[PDB]
A paper describes a structure:
CA forms the capsid shell surrounding the viral core that protects and transports the viral genome and also interacts with host cell factors that are necessary for trafficking, nuclear entry and proviral integration. Our studies of HML2 CArec show that an ERV retains the ability to form capsid assemblies using the same architecture as exogenous viruses. Analysis of the shell structures reveals the intra- and inter-molecular interactions that drives CA assembly into pentamers and hexamers and their association into shells that encapsidate the retroviral genome.
Structural superimposition with exogenous retroviral CA domains revealed the strongest similarity of CArec-NTD with the CA-NTD of the beta and alpharetroviruses Jaagsiekte sheep retrovirus (JSRV) and Rous sarcoma virus (RSV) (Z-scores 10.7 and 9.0) and the most distant relationship to the CA-NTD of the gammaretrovirus MLV. Importantly, although α11 displays the sequential and medium-range inter-residue nuclear Overhauser effect (NOE) cross-peaks that define a helical conformation, the higher T2, lower T1 and lower heteronuclear 1H-15N NOE values observed in NMR relaxation experiments together indicate it is more dynamic than the core domain (α7–α10). Exceptions were the N-terminal β-hairpin that contains a large loop insertion and is more mobile than in the crystal structure, and the NTD–CTD linker region of D5 and D6 equatorial hexamers that displayed weaker density.
Author numbering:
A (entry chain B): 1 to 5, 21 to 149
B (entry chain A): 1 to 6, 23 to 151
Write the structure that this text describes.
Amino acid sequence: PVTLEVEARYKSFSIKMLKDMKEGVKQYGPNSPYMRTLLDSIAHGHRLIPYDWEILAKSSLSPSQFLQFKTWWIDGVQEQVRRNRAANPPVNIDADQLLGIGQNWSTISQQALMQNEAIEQVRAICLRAWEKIQ
Amino acid sequence: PVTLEPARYKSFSIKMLKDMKEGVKQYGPNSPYMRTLLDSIAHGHRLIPYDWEILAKSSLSPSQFLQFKTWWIDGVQEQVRRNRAANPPVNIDADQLLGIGQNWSTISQQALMQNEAIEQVRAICLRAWEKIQDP
């Protein structure tokens, strides 16, 4: 997660939290009330960049579950970019920022400068993607 | 939880607290389910004593809550003995670990707690939670 001291600083997830979450997904399922409670609290209790989401997902999910998450992340990005382009005025956030990739957004330091609207879009897209894991 | 390390505070969502209360109702405070969920939350967020109080009070029956608080205080008493006896001494007292008194009763004060104190609070409260008995 990113903290805004404004000066943005990145702090990695707790190793124990990650271990807890991987074991919880395994025992209860990625969308059990168990995981929904935990994940929602983390997502809304922190400023998460795409890097954070990639870490949470890759660490917590089985390989097949992770593939599902990524496809739905990409699906949510398609829809979001469409809404961004159609907004009046257009919202200048594209897929590179929402996925955390490319020359402008691939590094943690770049992503840490993401504005509120972008953070909110990433949060909604990734929570939806997680919820769509079957 | 505290949203900026030493600083400000954001409450748990009403929904999250409802889920925790339902989880305790369905599975009990010391199900592996609740134990690992609590552990996850406690390592996923920076919890001050005020958070622990809200979580416990919201999730537990009055008698379970009294047990939790009794064991939190007991664990604090043991931790303070250890802090005093440490070489060098750890300058963390019972009022900080419990979030009480002139120095620590407010969220604004608690939000300035450093890592060692947050960690001590976490260990003590997780242990106290485990000491709660079922109906």
